[PDB]
Amino acid sequence: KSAYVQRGAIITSDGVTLAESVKQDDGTYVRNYPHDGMASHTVGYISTQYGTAGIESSMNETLTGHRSALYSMAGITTGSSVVLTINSQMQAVAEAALQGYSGSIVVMDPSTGAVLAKASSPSYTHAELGTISQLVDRTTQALYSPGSSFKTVTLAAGIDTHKTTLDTTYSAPGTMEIGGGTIHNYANEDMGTIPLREAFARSSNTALAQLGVALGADNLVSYARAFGYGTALGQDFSTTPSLMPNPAEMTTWELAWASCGLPVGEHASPAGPQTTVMQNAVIAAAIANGGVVMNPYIVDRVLSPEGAVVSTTSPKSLGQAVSADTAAQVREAMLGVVESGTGMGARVPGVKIAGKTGTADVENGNFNSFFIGFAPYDHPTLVVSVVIEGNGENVLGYGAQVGGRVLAQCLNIQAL
Ligand SMILES: *C(=O)[C@@H](NC(=O)[C@H]1[C@@H](C)ON[C@H]1c1c(Cl)cccc1Cl)[C@@H]1N[C@@H](C(O)O)C(C)(C)S1
Numbered sequence: 073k074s075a076y077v078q079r080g081a082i083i084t085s086d087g088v089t090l091a092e093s094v095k096q097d098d099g100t101y102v103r104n105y106p107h108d109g110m111a112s113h114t115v116g117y118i119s120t121q122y123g124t125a126g127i128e129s130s131m132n133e134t135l136t137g138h139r140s141a142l143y144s145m146a147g148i149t150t151g152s153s154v155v156l157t158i159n160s161q162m163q164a165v166a167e168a169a170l171q172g173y174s175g176s177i178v179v180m181d182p183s184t185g186a187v188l189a190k191a192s193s194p195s196y197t198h199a200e201l202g203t204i205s206q207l208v209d210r211t212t213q214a215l216y217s218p219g220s221s222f223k224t225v226t227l228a229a230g231i232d233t234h235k236t237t238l239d240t241t242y243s244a245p246g247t248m249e250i251g252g253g254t255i256h257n258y259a260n261e262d263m264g265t266i267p268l269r270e271a272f273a274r275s276s277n278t279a280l281a282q283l284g285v286a287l288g289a290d291n292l293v294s295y296a297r298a299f300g301y302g303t304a305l306g307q308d309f310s311t312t313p314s315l316m317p318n319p320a321e322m323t324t325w326e327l328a329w330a331s332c333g334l335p336v337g338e339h340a341s342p343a344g345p346q347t348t349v350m351q352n353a354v355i356a357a358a359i360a361n362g363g364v365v366m367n368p369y370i371v372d373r374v375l376s377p378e379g380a381v382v383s384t385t386s387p388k389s390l391g392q393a394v395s396a397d398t399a400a401q402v403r404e405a406m407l408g409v410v411e412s413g414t415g416m417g418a419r420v421p422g423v424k425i426a427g428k429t430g431t432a433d434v435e436n437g438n439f440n441s442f443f444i445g446f447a448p449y450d451h452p453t454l455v456v457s458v459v460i461e462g463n464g465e466n467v468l469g470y471g472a473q474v475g476g477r478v479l480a481q482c483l484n485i486q487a488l
Pocket residue numbers: 218219220221256257258274275276277329332333334414428429430431432433469
């Protein structure tokens with residue numbers, strides 16, 4: 073029966089139709105994808121060979137459309153349409169910034185969790201699914217070691233528990249023994265004794281590991297969970313949960329590394345942290361939003377075949393991960409990263425951008441570049457989360473450059 077019932081459309085917030093059904097002279101309907109290639113992973117597909125993904129999958133009941141003994145009357149009833157929170161201009165900006173690279177970008181509204189752009193690369197067209205890495209959604213369904221981008225969580229926790237302050241000094245030596253193994257700063261750089269805001273801006277592992285060990289495993293895990301770890305984020309799309317160990321299984325050395333964003337644990341529970349890019353955006357959004365974590369969403373509203381609004385998504389909080397005072401301090405620390413530390417590549421003349429960078433080593437001596445951030449600093453209206461994957465190219469600092477560029481172009485779009 074269901075080939076004769078028209079499937080609803082998938083449309084961006086600014087009115088660009090990305091999926092559509094057209095009636096045949098046969099009476100059946102064929103699925104068409106205008107601007108084929110835009111937001112492919114988000115729009116998704118239903119394919120015997122390739123599976124299901126994206127909105128075609130997650131909103132399938134709504135688009136399908138819930139007397140039936142007559143196939144001739146099946147036409148008389150239409151699926152309802154879905155208007156996404158994705159803006160086509162911001163989507164194009166994120167897609168352009170990934171050309172030539174593997175990785176992904178999420179742009180989100182920090183006060184609501186609305187997903188404004190969501191891009192993964194390499195990508196595909198729907199036309200390609202009619203023949204025989206591209207199908208993986210690297211924003212929500214790939215896990216990465218977050219590296220130093222996770223120090224945002226460590227810092228937040230340290231401040232929120234009143235165990236440290238941005239002006240508290242730490243020894244930040246090139247190497248240090250912790251829990252019977254070694255932690256080293258990048259390039260074994262000895263930074264001497266410096267305030268935490270500077271250790272964070274310059275991304276010292278030896279300093280941040282000492283904070284992680286002061287916090288303890290229970291605290292670190294609990295705060296990661298409060299930011300969304302362990303939750304399949306997304307009101308209306310699938311995200312694979314970001315992972316932390318069972319804190320009871322962690323060692324001190326493991327803890328030290330985890331607090332710098334490197335999963336090195338060996339135990340029954342997973343090693344962590346392992347993050348999605350979406351989870352990283354949710355962390356930046358919580359910090360930008362006074363500590364309030366939002367469950368992100370990608371559907372704005374549902375429309376009936378006649379264009380009436382049938383329902384509207386409501387923003388929903390997953391709780392307050394840290395206090396407002398803590399969030400303000402973390403924002404300030406993040407401003408330092410971009411103004412005077414490892415995130416200077418994200419600077420954009422005439423707008424204050426804040427963020428945190430990371431770099432993580434993976435298999436075969438490859439490494440990935442991360443960035444989370446928000447803008448403008450005072451009254452944030454956008455959050456970005458990026459991963460640029462190395463795969464045998466050095467991409468040091470690329471996440472930050474991509475991040476700043478996307479924030480700046482997205483701010484301009486907002487201004488129009
Ligand atoms: C965080 O990303 C931290 N990264 C590193 O030190 C990385 C790279 C350079 O190699 N392996 C790493 C690692 C170590 Cl040695 C220790 C703990 C965690 C990791 Cl992922 C610093 N942050 C980055 C920047 O991108 O923020 C630097 C390259 C400045 S070093």
